[PDB]
Amino acid sequence: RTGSSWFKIFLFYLIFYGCLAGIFIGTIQVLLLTLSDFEPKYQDRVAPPGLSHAPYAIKTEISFSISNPKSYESFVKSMHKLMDLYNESSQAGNSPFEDCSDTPADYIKRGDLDDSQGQKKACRFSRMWLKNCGYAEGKPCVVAKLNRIIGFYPKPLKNTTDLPEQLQANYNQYVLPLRCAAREKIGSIEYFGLGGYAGFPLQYYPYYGKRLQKKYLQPLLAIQFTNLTQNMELRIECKVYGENIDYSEKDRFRGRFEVKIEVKS
Amino acid sequence: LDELKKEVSMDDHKLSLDELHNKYGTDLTRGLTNARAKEILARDGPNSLTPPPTTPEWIKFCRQLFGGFSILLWIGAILCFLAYGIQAATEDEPANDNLYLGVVLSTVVIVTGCFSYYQEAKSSRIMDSFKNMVPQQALVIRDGEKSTINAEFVVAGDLVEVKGGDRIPADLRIISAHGCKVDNSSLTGESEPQTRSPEFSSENPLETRNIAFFSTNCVEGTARGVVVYTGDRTVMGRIATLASGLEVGRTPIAIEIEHFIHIITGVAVFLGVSFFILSLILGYSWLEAVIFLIGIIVANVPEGLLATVTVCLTLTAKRMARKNCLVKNLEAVETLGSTSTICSDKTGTLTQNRMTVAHMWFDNQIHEADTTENQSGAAFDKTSATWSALSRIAALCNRAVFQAGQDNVPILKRSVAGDASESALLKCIELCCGSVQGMRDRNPKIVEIPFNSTNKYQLSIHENEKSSESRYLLVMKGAPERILDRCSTILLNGAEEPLKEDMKEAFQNAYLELGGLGERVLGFCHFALPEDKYNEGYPFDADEPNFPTTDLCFVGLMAMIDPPRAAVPDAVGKCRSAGIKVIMVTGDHPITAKAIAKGVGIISEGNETIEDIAARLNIPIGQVNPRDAKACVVHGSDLKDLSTEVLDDILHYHTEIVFARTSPQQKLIIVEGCQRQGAIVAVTGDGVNDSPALKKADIGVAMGISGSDVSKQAADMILLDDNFASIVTGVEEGRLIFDNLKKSIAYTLTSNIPEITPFLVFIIGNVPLPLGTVTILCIDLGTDMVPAISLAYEQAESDIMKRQPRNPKTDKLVNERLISMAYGQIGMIQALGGFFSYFVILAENGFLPMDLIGKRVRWDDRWISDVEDSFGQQWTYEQRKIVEFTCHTSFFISIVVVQWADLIICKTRRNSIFQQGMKNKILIFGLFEETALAAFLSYCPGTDVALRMYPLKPSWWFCAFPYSLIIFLYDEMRRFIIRRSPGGWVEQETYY
Amino acid sequence: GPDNDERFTYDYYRLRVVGLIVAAVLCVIGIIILLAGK
Numbered sequence A: 001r002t003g004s005s006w007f008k009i010f011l012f013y014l015i016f017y018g019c020l021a022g023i024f025i026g027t028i029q030v031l032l033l034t035l036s037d038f039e040p041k042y043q044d045r046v047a048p049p050g051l052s053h054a055p056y057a058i059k060t061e062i063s064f065s066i067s068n069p070k071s072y073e074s075f076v077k078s079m080h081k082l083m084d085l086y087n088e089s090s091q092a093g094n095s096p097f098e099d100c101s102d103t104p105a106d107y108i109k110r111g112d113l114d115d116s117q118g119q120k121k122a123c124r125f126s127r128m129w130l131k132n133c134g135y136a137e138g139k140p141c142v143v144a145k146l147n148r149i150i151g152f153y154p155k156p157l158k159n160t161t162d163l164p165e166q167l168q169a170n171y172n173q174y175v176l177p178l179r180c181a182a183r184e185k186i187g188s189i190e191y192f193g194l195g196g197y198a199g200f201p202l203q204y205y206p207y208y209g210k211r212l213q214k215k216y217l218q219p220l221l222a223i224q225f226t227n228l229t230q231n232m233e234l235r236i237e238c239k240v241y242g243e244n245i246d247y248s249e250k251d252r253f254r255g256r257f258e259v260k261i262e263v264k265s
Numbered sequence B: 001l002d003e004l005k006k007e008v009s010m011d012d013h014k015l016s017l018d019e020l021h022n023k024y025g026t027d028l029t030r031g032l033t034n035a036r037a038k039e040i041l042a043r044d045g046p047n048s049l050t051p052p053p054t055t056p057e058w059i060k061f062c063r064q065l066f067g068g069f070s071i072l073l074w075i076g077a078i079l080c081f082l083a084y085g086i087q088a089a090t091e092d093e094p095a096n097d098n099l100y101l102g103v104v105l106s107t108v109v110i111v112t113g114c115f116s117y118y119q120e121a122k123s124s125r126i127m128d129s130f131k132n133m134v135p136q137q138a139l140v141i142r143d144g145e146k147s148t149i150n151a152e153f154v155v156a157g158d159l160v161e162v163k164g165g166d167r168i169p170a171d172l173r174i175i176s177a178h179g180c181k182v183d184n185s186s187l188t189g190e191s192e193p194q195t196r197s198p199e200f201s202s203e204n205p206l207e208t209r210n211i212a213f214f215s216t217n218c219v220e221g222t223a224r225g226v227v228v229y230t231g232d233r234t235v236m237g238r239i240a241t242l243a244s245g246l247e248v249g250r251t252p253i254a255i256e257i258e259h260f261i262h263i264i265t266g267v268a269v270f271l272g273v274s275f276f277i278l279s280l281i282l283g284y285s286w287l288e289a290v291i292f293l294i295g296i297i298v299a300n301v302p303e304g305l306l307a308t309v310t311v312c313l314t315l316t317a318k319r320m321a322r323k324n325c326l327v328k329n330l331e332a333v334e335t336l337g338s339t340s341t342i343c344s345d346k347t348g349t350l351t352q353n354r355m356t357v358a359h360m361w362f363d364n365q366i367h368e369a370d371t372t373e374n375q376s377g378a379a380f381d382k383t384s385a386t387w388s389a390l391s392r393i394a395a396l397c398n399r400a401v402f403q404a405g406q407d408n409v410p411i412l413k414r415s416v417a418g419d420a421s422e423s424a425l426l427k428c429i430e431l432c433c434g435s436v437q438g439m440r441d442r443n444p445k446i447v448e449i450p451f452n453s454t455n456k457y458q459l460s461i462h463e464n465e466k467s468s469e470s471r472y473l474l475v476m477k478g479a480p481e482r483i484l485d486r487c488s489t490i491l492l493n494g495a496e497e498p499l500k501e502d503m504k505e506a507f508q509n510a511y512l513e514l515g516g517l518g519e520r521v522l523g524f525c526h527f528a529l530p531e532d533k534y535n536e537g538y539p540f541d542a543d544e545p546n547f548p549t550t551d552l553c554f555v556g557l558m559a560m561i562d563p564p565r566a567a568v569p570d571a572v573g574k575c576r577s578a579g580i581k582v583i584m585v586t587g588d589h590p591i592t593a594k595a596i597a598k599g600v601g602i603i604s605e606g607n608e609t610i611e612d613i614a615a616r617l618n619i620p621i622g623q624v625n626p627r628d629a630k631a632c633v634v635h636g637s638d639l640k641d642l643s644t645e646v647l648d649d650i651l652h653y654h655t656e657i658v659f660a661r662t663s664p665q666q667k668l669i670i671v672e673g674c675q676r677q678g679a680i681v682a683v684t685g686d687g688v689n690d691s692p693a694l695k696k697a698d699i700g701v702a703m704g705i706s707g708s709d710v711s712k713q714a715a716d717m718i719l720l721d722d723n724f725a726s727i728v729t730g731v732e733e734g735r736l737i738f739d740n741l742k743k744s745i746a747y748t749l750t751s752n753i754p755e756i757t758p759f760l761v762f763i764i765g766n767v768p769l770p771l772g773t774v775t776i777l778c779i780d781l782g783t784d785m786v787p788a789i790s791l792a793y794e795q796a797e798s799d800i801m802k803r804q805p806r807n808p809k810t811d812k813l814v815n816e817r818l819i820s821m822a823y824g825q826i827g828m829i830q831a832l833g834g835f836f837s838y839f840v841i842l843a844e845n846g847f848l849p850m851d852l853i854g855k856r857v858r859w860d861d862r863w864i865s866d867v868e869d870s871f872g873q874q875w876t877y878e879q880r881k882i883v884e885f886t887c888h889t890s891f892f893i894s895i896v897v898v899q900w901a902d903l904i905i906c907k908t909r910r911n912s913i914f915q916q917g918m919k920n921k922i923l924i925f926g927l928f929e930e931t932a933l934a935a936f937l938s939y940c941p942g943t944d945v946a947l948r949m950y951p952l953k954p955s956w957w958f959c960a961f962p963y964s965l966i967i968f969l970y971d972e973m974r975r976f977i978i979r980r981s982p983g984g985w986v987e988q989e990t991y992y
Numbered sequence C: 001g002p003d004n005d006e007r008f009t010y011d012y013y014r015l016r017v018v019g020l021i022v023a024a025v026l027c028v029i030g031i032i033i034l035l036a037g038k
């Protein structure tokens, strides 16, 4: 508390906090310089991919009434918010999109992570490939996807030893297998994929990242539970497999879901 | 209440013995009846002191449990339970998150309770020390026969008998006494025995010879007296109540802290609410804007600050114990440094309490002996043949003896059997002439006339060691005028000589000068007896002068005094340079008081009392202008008649004050008078008559060895070695730590800012939370601790004894200059250092700063497990969270890195780190151990769940570095300014 | 090539090892300095 001296305070901070914002910004802007536009410096924190899905699960749960239409207007929203993305109206011209193997094929290298070439071209994906999926008002349809990682080639396990879905139409070479499970077998699993299989096609990898590939489209795998059980909380775990895929006791989303469906009506 | 006790006593030594019995329904010769004794008991109550209203054990601990931050921390704990309550009910989130969070906060106080229950303890056993002085039994006469009784059963009226060795059981009127001497040190602080006779001798009850006081002890003789006062109603019974029942009060340091808690609260609630209204303007309800206000507690409340101040206080006290200086209270560590006036008792405090030979007069010359403990002075004379003739009388005409078994202990410290003056002579000769026993053997005593009351002299006759004689020597000593009235000759430099009126005056000079030094004077003379009239086996008559007692050879004078302790004069000098006022306050007589006053420097050369002037000028004192007198010397008998306002003025108007012949209540008044002015006062004393004063001082210091137990109980500090120079040290410590505490407040508070800003910008910028609750506690109860504590080993940045005492009203421990420095400036550079590491971690994991704005809602959205980063990648909940907690971890570490700087710059308030150097090893220890703790919390496995602390990549460690160095430079720059321009700007804005 | 898997690994174990080692050393050094006299 002074007088005719406050001007000696205000003016001080004006060009001291000035000098300091100026230095702080000074150091952000140097740091920023030393990073790729195309690729982060570290990726060991997305290290194995997580598996995420379209139905916005309140708390990993989808309890809803069949005898009510708006008892599930919510989930349908996120479904369409996601699905509106896979429009064939959107994917227009030979640029920047590409028609790819209607059947799961191999990886597609598109050069380096440079801008020496324009936008790296992106494979197409018809939402029609998700036959069957308002969605399932009963016995719901759930859409799965693999979290994008720049330069990540997902590698399906090679058939050598025992494998859960034992060699059943196993596309060993070019598909990343997704199986859903819960003992307690009161469901009816069905899988709408690309070429018909229940996995992700290797022909979408590696992801090249937004700055080099905006409007890129990652695959999907519809999962319909036209089960023969009703009006109870059912705990099902969809999970992906592969060499590059691991799971965690804490990250309950690390390469897998956990859904609490309840078609209560 | 206690004001009545501050008045002096009123009595009945003037009554006749008969009148006294009359007044107490008692018989002088038979004493009370067993019947009337018992009756008079239930009437008045026991001969016993009534214990003071103590303060219980429970309430002592519980009053600390709301010690500022304490209460505020309950508000957090309780409101973090507003979280676990709404959660574990509606939305059961299974965790120890906000439960265990809430818990820590409160039990942070409970265990901390022992630190302020360590800071404000009280050793209050005054009354129990007083109670010890009442004997267990008394000898009364009832129904004409004497019997011993429980001393409590003693009542006003009955006949009591006391003899050498025992304690005065109650206040008595002497009706009969035979050769009775008494020790009244409990009242006067003077121990030399005093006669008791039945005849009243002074209108003053504390001075008359026919009253013997409780809390004193009959030293020799036999006496009988009538009990006039019992239990609480005795002179010293009142002193006990007064001393015991005083209101202790708040110390300076305590008041400095309380004042800091107000400033602290003051900004905790200004920002606390300021981020309720700002949160509201941004779209937050009374469910969100409220949770943040209470939110902004921890960040503002230093949880580690109490503990720090305490360990600092404690660590300083430990050093002073290592200098033979015991402190009973933690708060008492500082007070000596804020002390403006010291009220010192004289005897056994400033002085050694030990009649020592000070000067001699012989060879027509004044000499000065060494009076110090360790005899630090020099040799005065040994050559003179006179000296030895004198020495001879001093050793021979002397009946004192060194108590058995002390060859181990030094002369001046060893206990002697005998009166003070004779012990003085004994210790003098033993010291500078070898064994006195040696002399008393070589010259056997054949007869002597012990010092009479009437003769006013003591002589002996001795066989002379000299074989060529082996004839008879006469030696005598006594009143210097009386020894000259019995002299014909004078041993000058070996040979006798007529006592010319010329010398009869050089003596008379010496006698008056030494007498003026406030010293006790003795005359000495001898006579080599004429062998003719005195055979080898000649008989002498000590009953009737069978020998000459007139016309003897005068040899010399010796003068003695209870002299100052060695370092006292200098100790006084040092305090006065520190701008501290030293006032003597003594129960002793004024001549003696004043003499020592001059001797220890309380009164300086040239200074004068009105009486000095009037004597010099040969005018009346009514005609002296009082303001010409800077010194004064006030007798207790005069002090008694003065109003408190009149004392205040005496206090205002003098620089060199001596209150002499003061009672215990009067020492208290002076102190109260001194405090009334505003001063912080240290009482230093050693007797039961200092108790009320010690107990009233802001800090009471007592003498360890000589100190009575009562003084010791009443004090806050004990000088275990009776080394008064310790006082100087104490003030110097109290000054040092006051400063070094500021430094530790500054250091601790600075990290407040980098801990707060993150949560704010979290709300204001909608970015992910940069630092977490848990992370902050590791800084406050972990990494900042040893650094904070270690600042107490900082030194002086100048000669702090060279500066005046602080004005306690104006010079606060925590001022605005410190908040603007810790908050406005340094803490601000610290926040950016932290925020930088933040942006680095996220930016390097794919979240550039620009995209961070507005995200927290997605980011903290637990249901999104595919948050898209800046590069296009997708993140689960736990994934991104692991990154955030890594940020929490590197932010934590950023602080440490910049607390490095804050530590080195808080090391000094004025000096360059290049001037002060880095000799503080505890501080350096702080840096290493602090960093070791952080590395631990980061890299130790398990601490990623027990504390959500993640490992840091080596590069992470250096983010803050440019910010740590900028702090060093900024501050080193700024104090370089300070020094160059002492007068004005940077100093008046930022100098602590 | 298609076998770039080091791009998603970090040796946190060795970090945690070297971190603790350094912590222990700094810890010790601190003592050595403090106990320069007691």
Ligand SMILES: C[C@@H]1O[C@@H](O[C@H]2C[C@@H](O)[C@]3(CO)[C@H]4[C@H](O)C[C@]5(C)[C@@H](C6=CC(=O)OC6)CC[C@]5(O)[C@@H]4CC[C@]3(O)C2)[C@H](O)[C@H](O)[C@H]1O
Residues within 6 Å of the ligand: B083, B288, B291, B292, B294, B295, B296, B297, B298, B299, B300, B301, B759, B769, B771, B772, B773, B774, B860
């Ligand atoms: C906007 C807000 O953000 C999320 O919660 C935020 C507010 C609140 O909930 C808490 C926990 O209670 C706060 C708490 O309150 C205040 C703090 C004690 C605060 C301090 C101030 C201080 O002085 O020391 C420390 C800084 C962080 C703090 O340690 C926690 C951190 C976790 C958080 O969770 C964060 C939720 O998503 C919430 O639902 C949403 O409303």
Ligand SMILES: CC(C)CCC[C@@H](C)[C@H]1CC[C@H]2[C@@H]3CC=C4C[C@@H](O)CC[C@]4(C)[C@H]3CC[C@]12C
Residues within 6 Å of the ligand: A001, B757, B760, B816, B817, B819, B820, B821, B823, B824, B825
């Ligand atoms: C998160 C951001 C907005 C924090 C910035 C807070 C700033 C504006 C605050 C915090 C600490 C404050 C300073 C600290 C204390 C003092 C000393 C006082 O006698 C006058 C004001 C002054 C000089 C303050 C001015 C404003 C100040 C600098």
Ligand SMILES: [K+]
Residues within 6 Å of the ligand: B298, B299, B300, B301, B302, B303, B752, B755, B776, B780
């Ligand atoms: K804090």
Ligand SMILES: [K+]
Residues within 6 Å of the ligand: B248, B694, B695, B696, B697, B698, B699, B700, B716
């Ligand atoms: K006191």
Ligand SMILES: [K+]
Residues within 6 Å of the ligand: B302, B748, B749, B750, B751, B752, B780
């Ligand atoms: K702090």
Ligand SMILES: [Mg+2]
Residues within 6 Å of the ligand: B189, B345, B346, B347, B348, B349, B685, B686, B687
């Ligand atoms: Mg004394």
